Paper text:
The transient receptor potential channel subfamily A member 1 ([name]) ion channel is an evolutionary conserved polymodal sensor responding to noxious temperature or chemical stimuli. [name] is a member of the transient receptor potential (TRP) superfamily with a symbolic cytosolic domain formed by a particularly large number of ankyrin repeats (ARs). As with hTRPA1, the transmembrane domain of each subunit consists of six transmembrane α-helices (S1–S6), with S1–S4 forming the voltage-sensor-like domain (VSLD) and S5–S6 forming the pore domain organised in a domain-swapped manner.
However, in state-1, the ARD is prominently stabilised in a four-leaf propeller-shaped structure, and the high local resolutions allow modelling of 17 ARs in total (AR0–AR16). The N-terminus starts from residue number 58, with most of the ARs faithfully assigned. Strikingly, compared with that of state-2 structure, the coiled-coil domain has a large downward movement with ~12–13 Å. One is between AR16 of one subunit and the nexus domain from the adjacent subunit (the loop between the first two β-strands), named interface-1, and the other is within the ARDs between two adjacent subunits (AR6–AR9 of one subunit and AR12–AR14 of the neighbouring subunit), named interface-2. The state-1 structure might represent an initial closed, or resting state of [name]-A isoform.
Author numbering:
A (entry chain D): 514 to 696, 713 to 781, 819 to 1098
B (entry chain A): 942 to 1026
C (entry chain C): 856 to 941
Write the structure that this text describes.
């Protein structure tokens, strides 16, 4: 370092003014830095503006590592010396590690030095179009790392006008240019990342709401209603067909009489399954590895096979009914209605109660596999003690088998111990095989299975209802994102990208059109974005 | 309605209707009886075990399947939703 | 600590009961009676209740056995005080 490097590093402005007027020449130090790199490493924005006015060429030359003056002021978090180096016209070039200026501010996690770059007035949308190697999109990297910064980028996408807030020419402009980032066009890129990391403050912001209300009014309100009314034809023609089969079930082998009402219902079922399987086979062609992962598709294959096995005796020459047709009927009627609860998650007033039901069902599968130990622990222990009763009365027959003693143990943590019938009556007439231990395993049963385990499952289903009423706003907004995602995953691209807009101009003083009665019904019982 | 129809399919055509299977011989009666056995009285020994070891239960291995998924979610999972609310 | 620690005292009721269970496989004739059904059921029940003490240390499902063995410590202090009412 020369004394021009040392004086400008410490920011002594009157000394660097003195050395310039007496002809202090300029050259690099051993690192490669000029006097303006060093004054920018420290935060002295009075010495940057002096040196740039005298020697204007040394703003945008690099050291031996390829860093400019903007990288160096970003590597150690001087946000006042970034807003000055960008206003003078720094060049925004890449490092020798191929890592830009905004990269070091989202990699060292400096939220102050990355807010001074993406909120700059002149040069905002030249640092949000860099597309580096470690970060391919700056929008999708601020939502992951620093979500307070991206809330201050959405504030600058809402521009007003200056017309006194109540005149007839006051428009408010929304700009969706950053929520749709071209780098496989996944449908809502910047909102599937808000819900993956769970950012509720970036979904409830008034730019994201108008981005969904642009899509709700466009296409996404008619194609949820037209998915429920197609399923409610398969729902009705299954419960009608199983109800008719139970009356028309006469003898002679057992054989049904194929009337013109169970033959009409068996055709509407078998034609619904083919047309709703050739929608499945299209979705198999692109989306192979989520059929292990997603459950609601796997439910629809047990439903569709069972409804095909149900309708087979309406097509044979004689109606061949047997045990395997009652089995497939009851699985088809039960799964047709349990599928209907998956469509009622998205209603308005009553939708939250199926979110609470399917979250305390996810916990009770992890609990009822861990504490399937205790059912095997007792169910074997009652099979040892209670199976060799010398006269099996039809209350001890439920323990004469190893799988039957595991059902019976599970259906007496629900209340019916039958204490008088199979422990007291069979003891005072000298029939209980091992007396003083049968009252020991039972006395430790009713301490911990119907008291201690059933109060564990109540205490877990109060903490999974409170943690839905807590974050209910995230649960509602994540339904509408995942709705519009898969809806335009299926629509054709030719009249998809011509109906969205890049910017919405709104006039909040003109006489609005009154709401149509068809549109008024669609807003009462659907989770719409119009409830702000 | 999902279970009450499903028990009407499996349990209505028992070849000797004992007065514990008469509550499932009708579609509105199988919707009362399903609602009054999420309150505790499954009657597991009376209408599933006694009528199985004397060869009277019509479809055996599925009647223990709908019942085993009944007592997971109606008298455990639904009745602990109404306590947590 | 054998007075103080419980999981060692469980392992001695388990090991004695499994020895009494296997005695009629070693006698000249198999002498089975009531005391061999008693030791069999305590050995099968305590073999699996010991298995819940190893699942405390798993990742996703381990917290649910911590909750089970903490509401079991309270329900012993309560079901000795309110053994008066019984």
């Amino acid at each position: 370092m020369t004394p021009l490097h040392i004086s400008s590093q410490q920011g002594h402005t009157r000394v660097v003014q003195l050395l310039l007027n007496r002809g202090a020449l300029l050259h690099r130090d051993h690192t490669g830095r000029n006097p303006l790199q060093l004054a920018a490493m420290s935060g002295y924005t009075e010495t940057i503006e002096l040196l740039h006015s005298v020697h204007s060429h040394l703003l945008d030359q690099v050291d031996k590592d390829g860093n400019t003056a903007l990288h160096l002021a970003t590597m150690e978090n001087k946000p006042h010396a970034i807003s000055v180096l960008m206003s003078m016209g720094c060049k925004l070039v890449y490092n020798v590690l191929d890592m830009s200026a905004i990269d070091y501010a989202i990699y060292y996690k400096y939220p102050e030095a990355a807010l001074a770059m993406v909120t700059h007035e002149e040069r905002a949308n030249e640092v949000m179009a860099l597309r580096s190697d470690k970060h391919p999109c700056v929008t999708l990297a601020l939502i992951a790392s620093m979500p307070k910064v991206f809330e201050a980028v959405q504030d600058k996408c809402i521009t007003k006008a200056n017309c006194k807030k109540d005149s007839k020419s006051f428009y408010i402009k929304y700009s969706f240019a950053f929520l749709q980032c071209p780098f496989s066009p996944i449908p809502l890129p910047a909102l599937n990342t808000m819900v993956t990391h769970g950012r509720v403050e970036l979904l409830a912001h008034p730019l994201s709401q108008k981005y969904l209300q642009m899509k709700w009014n466009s296409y996404g309100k008619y194609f949820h209603l037209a998915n429920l009314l197609i399923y409610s034809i398969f729902l009705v023609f299954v419960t009608i067909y199983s109800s008719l089969m139970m009356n028309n079930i006469e003898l002679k082998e057992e054989r049904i009489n194929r009337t013109t009402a169970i033959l009409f219902c068996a055709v509407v079922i078998v034609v619904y399954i083919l047309l709703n399987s050739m929608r499945e086979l299209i979705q198999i062609y692109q989306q192979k590895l989520h059929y292990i992962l997603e459950t609601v598709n796997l439910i629809s294959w047990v439903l569709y096979i069972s409804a095909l096995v149900m309708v087979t005796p309406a097509f044979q020459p004689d109606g061949g009914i047997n045990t395997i047709h009652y089995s497939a009927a009851s699985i088809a009627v039960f799964l047709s209605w349990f599928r209907l609860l998956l469509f009622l998650q998205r209603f308005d007033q009553v939708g939250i109660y199926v979110v609470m039901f399917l979250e305390i069902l996810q916990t009770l599968i992890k609990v009822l596999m861990v504490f399937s130990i205790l059912i095997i622990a007792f169910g074997l222990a009652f099979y040892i003690l209670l199976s060799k009763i010398i006269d099996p009365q039809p209350n001890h027959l439920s323990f004469s088998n190893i799988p039957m003693s595991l059902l019976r143990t599970f259906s007496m943590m629900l209340g019916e111990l039958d204490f008088v019938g199979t422990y007291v009556n069979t003891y005072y007439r000298d029939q209980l095989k091992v007396p003083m231990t049968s009252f020991l395993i039972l006395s430790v049963f009713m301490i911990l299975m119907p008291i201690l385990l059933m109060n564990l499952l109540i205490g877990l289903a109060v903490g999974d209802i409170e943690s839905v009423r807590r974050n209910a706003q995230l649960k509602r907004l994540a339904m509408q994102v995942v709705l519009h995602t898969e809806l335009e995953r299926k629509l054709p691209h030719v009249w998809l990208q011509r109906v969205d807009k890049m910017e919405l101009i709104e006039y909040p003083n003109e006489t609005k059109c009154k709401l149509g009665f068809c549109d008024f019904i669609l807003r009462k019982w659907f989770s719409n974005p119009f409830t702000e």
